[PDB]
Amino acid sequence: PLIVPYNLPLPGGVVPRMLITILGTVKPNANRIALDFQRGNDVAFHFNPRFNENNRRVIVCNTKLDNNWGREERQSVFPFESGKPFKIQVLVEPDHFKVAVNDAHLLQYNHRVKKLNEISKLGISGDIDLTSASYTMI
Ligand SMILES: O=C(O)[C@H]1O[C@H](O[C@@H]2[C@H](O)[C@@H](O)[C@@H](O[C@@H]3[C@H](O)[C@@H](O)[C@H](O)O[C@@H]3C(=O)O)O[C@@H]2C(=O)O)[C@H](O)[C@@H](O)[C@H]1O
């Protein structure tokens, strides 16, 4: 396993056809997970499962620019479960990030940060045991 929070460098940023795969297990009584695709200090794509927001489970996605969070995009389909292993796949497409969990499509997030080749780090944090983090061009 890998120490959380974990930094995965994305050399030369992201580009359409690049697939980022995260494997791990949700801890018991998890509160949150976060995948933060960063352009320097900016967060181009915050992918943020929340297990207990007012007794509901929800996937929140957002962008941070100049330390200002933007308008959230929320998805109530929630494929994660405390205690269970997961796979998150983030496929970069020309106009959005496409996310699949356990091989089932979950959501898409339109690119707000336009300089894809400057989104050069993925931060992985939260209540997980992290097994692997990698990318491939498809
Ligand atoms: O429980 C609450 O309602 C909570 O609300 C605020 O915090 C929320 C949120 O829960 C925090 O996690 C944080 O979210 C930031 C960011 O602001 C948001 O736009 C982005 O999508 O996610 C971020 C993240 O995950 O870190 O801040 C939120 C906020 O409203 O400010 C209160 O700050 C907190 O005290 C609590 O009441």
Side-chain angles (χ1 to χ4, degrees), residues 110-120 122-136:
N110 196 77
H111 294 307
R112 301 191 194 171
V113 174
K114 310 294 175 183
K115 289 170 175 169
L116 296 191
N117 54 5
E118 291 181 14
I119 307 170
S120 301
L122 168 63
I124 308 166
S125 62
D127 303 319
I128 62 161
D129 299 326
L130 183 58
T131 299
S132 64
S134 66
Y135 44 78
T136 193

Side-chain angles (χ1 to χ4, degrees), residues 28-53:
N29 309 307
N31 188 64
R32 64 185 289 271
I33 302 160
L35 271 59
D36 290 306
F37 290 88
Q38 306 141 312
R39 170 172 179 259
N41 185 59
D42 283 358
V43 183
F45 178 35
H46 172 72
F47 172 87
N48 180 207
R50 300 184 181 176
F51 287 79
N52 190 344
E53 188 190 68

Side-chain angles (χ1 to χ4, degrees), residues 32 34 46 48 50 53-54 60-63 69-72:
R32 64 185 289 271
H46 172 72
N48 180 207
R50 300 184 181 176
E53 188 190 68
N54 294 328
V60 175
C61 296
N62 207 353
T63 292
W69 285 106
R71 221 161 290 111
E72 290 179 338

Side-chain angles (χ1 to χ4, degrees), residues 57-119:
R57 307 202 286 180
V58 62
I59 310 293
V60 175
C61 296
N62 207 353
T63 292
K64 197 167 64 173
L65 308 170
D66 293 340
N67 265 13
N68 292 333
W69 285 106
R71 221 161 290 111
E72 290 179 338
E73 296 181 33
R74 284 170 172 252
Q75 165 68 272
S76 264
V77 178
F78 195 91
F80 300 97
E81 307 274 353
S82 291
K84 295 199 197 185
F86 62 83
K87 177 173 70 174
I88 303 165
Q89 289 170 305
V90 181
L91 180 59
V92 182
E93 293 195 328
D95 294 300
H96 52 254
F97 296 95
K98 193 179 68 193
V99 180
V101 177
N102 305 337
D103 292 311
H105 174 71
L106 177 62
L107 59 80
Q108 298 188 354
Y109 189 81
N110 196 77
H111 294 307
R112 301 191 194 171
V113 174
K114 310 294 175 183
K115 289 170 175 169
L116 296 191
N117 54 5
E118 291 181 14
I119 307 170

Side-chain angles (χ1 to χ4, degrees), residues 4-18:
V4 178
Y6 186 88
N7 178 46
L8 174 71
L10 306 176
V14 304
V15 63
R17 287 171 75 163
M18 169 185 205

